[PDB]
Design a protein around this ligand. Structure first.
Ligand SMILES: *C/C=C(C)/C=C/C=C(C)/C=C/C1=C(C)CCCC1(C)C
Ligand code: NA
Ligand code: NA
Length: 137
């Protein structure tokens, strides 16, 4: 697969509920929904090595990983975690996260290239799923 691109959002679903499950308080959720519902995602892929930069006005992140090798990042609610990405299938990666400290909902994210040229991202907390869809700019 080639995930590389400057991806722009065309759909976002269920972000507020995700934050609610993660325990983000109502005022902070309002702020996040208003400001972080339209991320821009830059991906650079070389084989199974990835760089992903996600930009919103309230948080810019950059991660670097190799599929199958643990790395450190943060959950969507900003808690440090260990992460491990695997190929669920040829065109879909899945990242399982484990908090460095304390307890919380089980979190994960996925990225999937669709047959139409788009990118589906999901973020999960326990059973709740937030889905974003992107197309290259
Ligand atoms: C695809 C979904 C994305 C990139 C979600 C991003 C979420 C944020 C940048 C959330 C930020 C915040 C909180 C979770 C708590 C309060 C402080 C914020 C607004 C920076
Ligand atoms: Na590959
Ligand atoms: Na490996």
């Amino acid at each position: 697969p080639n995930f590389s691109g400057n991806w722009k959002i065309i759909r976002s679903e269920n972000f507020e509920e995700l934050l609610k499950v993660l325990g983000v308080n109502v005022m902070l959720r309002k702020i996040a929904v208003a400001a972080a519902s339209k991320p821009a995602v830059e991906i650079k892929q070389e084989g199974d090595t990835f760089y992903i930069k996600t930009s919103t006005t309230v948080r810019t992140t950059e991660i670097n990983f190799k599929v199958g090798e643990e790395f450190e990042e943060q959950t969507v609610d900003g808690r440090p975690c260990k992460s491990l990405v695997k190929w669920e299938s040829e065109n879909k990666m899945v990242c399982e996260q484990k908090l460095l400290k304390g307890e919380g909902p089980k979190t994960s994210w996925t990225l999937e290239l669709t047959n139409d040229g788009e990118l589906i991202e999901t973020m999960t907390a326990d059973d709740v799923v937030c889905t974003k869809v992107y197309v290259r700019e």
